Design a protein around this ligand. Structure first.
Ligand SMILES: CCCCCCO[C@@H]1O[C@H](CO)[C@H](O)[C@H](O)[C@H]1O[C@@H]1O[C@@H](C)[C@@H](O)[C@@H](O)[C@@H]1O
Ligand SMILES: O=c1ccn([C@@H]2O[C@H](COP(=O)(O)OP(=O)(O)O)[C@@H](O)[C@H]2O)c(=O)[nH]1
Ligand SMILES: [Hg+2]
Ligand SMILES: [Hg+2]
Ligand SMILES: [Hg+2]
Ligand SMILES: [Hg+2]
Length: 263
């Protein structure tokens, strides 16, 4: 809405690609977020001027509650710093949630295990798993109506090799001649409306599958891939956003490892 203020930064170079080792835009013109493609100062200004609030949701059941401390502490250091953040921790052990110190303008809600609530409390929803830790910047550059994240183990793979559900009897079915990328089932998000739209579709498709006595090879991830194939994401995050250094090392194509699994 409102105008940006005067800002001093390097002029974009029309005749100089911002990364010549990777694809930075999809065939449907959605940017693929890699380090070096964005100026965070410009983006921070745009989103702060809109007083953007980001909801971060995580489920922590049973032994997984033990990962909450590191998850939240690192999120405090790297996730949407400077912006309004609302953490939503869904757990079966409310009293076991760690007492983590939060920066100003950030809050945490513990939900024991109300979709309308999201619509009134946050502008965007980011859905991830708890057994992870932030190691570098994860900010507003990811915000968009709907985004998926390139799976770290298959970003360089051909579609035939993707572990999509291959049985036609499943709602998540994707033939060998279809598919753009293999997205992570544990790092996606977008506007509340778009995220609820995706989860609602996934929930229904999985019910149809169980009624037909079939379970997708990679469960929710298989369905998320089917959804994003038919509903193109408006932004796609590079593997920088969900990496496993123990299993994959640190490739030259990765300038930053922002969010990683905890061994
Ligand atoms: C061919 C080499 C691929 C190496 C990555 C395998 O990752 C797993 O991929 C499947 C789909 O085929 C699922 O997405 C599964 O959750 C992935 O494993 C998990 O994520 C990877 C990155 C690693 O952190 C594993 O320890 C996790 O269990
Ligand atoms: O036997 C299992 C293993 C995992 N999960 C759930 O799946 C989520 C993600 O799984 P996992 O930790 O196995 O992820 P990965 O190793 O794929 O990173 C967890 O938060 C759990 O809620 C589960 O219900 N049963
Ligand atoms: Hg979510
Ligand atoms: Hg789906
Ligand atoms: Hg689902
Ligand atoms: Hg899904």
């Amino acid at each position: 809405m409102v105008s940006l203020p005067r800002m001093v930064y390097p002029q974009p170079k029309v005749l100089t690609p911002c990364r010549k080792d990777v694809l930075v835009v999809t065939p449907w013109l959605a940017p693929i977020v890699w380090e070096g493609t964005f100026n965070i100062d410009i983006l921070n200004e745009q989103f702060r001027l809109q007083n953007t609030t980001i909801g971060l949701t995580v489920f922590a059941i049973k032994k997984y509650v033990a990962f909450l401390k590191l998850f939240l502490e690192t999120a405090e250091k790297h996730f949407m710093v400077g912006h309004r953040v609302h953490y939503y921790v869904f757990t079966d052990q409310p009293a076991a949630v760690p007492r983590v110190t939060l920066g100003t303008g950030r809050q945490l809600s513990v939900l024991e295990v109300c979709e309308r609530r999201f619509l009134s409390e946050v502008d965007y929803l980011v859905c991830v798993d708890v057994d992870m830790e932030f190691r570098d910047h994860v900010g507003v550059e990811i915000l968009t109506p709907l985004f998926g994240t390139l799976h770290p183990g298959f970003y360089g793979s051909s579609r035939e090799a993707f572990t999509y559900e291959r049985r036609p009897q499943s709602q998540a079915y994707i033939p060998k001649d279809e598919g753009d990328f293999y997205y992570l089932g544990r790092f996606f998000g977008g506007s509340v409306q778009e995220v609820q739209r995706l989860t609602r579709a996934c929930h229904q498709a999985m019910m149809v599958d169980q009624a037909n006595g079939i379970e997708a090879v990679w469960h929710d991830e298989s369905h998320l891939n089917k959804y994003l194939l038919r509903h193109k994401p408006t932004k796609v995050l590079s593997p920088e956003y969900l990496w496993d250094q123990q299993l994959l090392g640190w490739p030259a194509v990765l300038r930053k490892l922002r969010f990683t699994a905890v061994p």
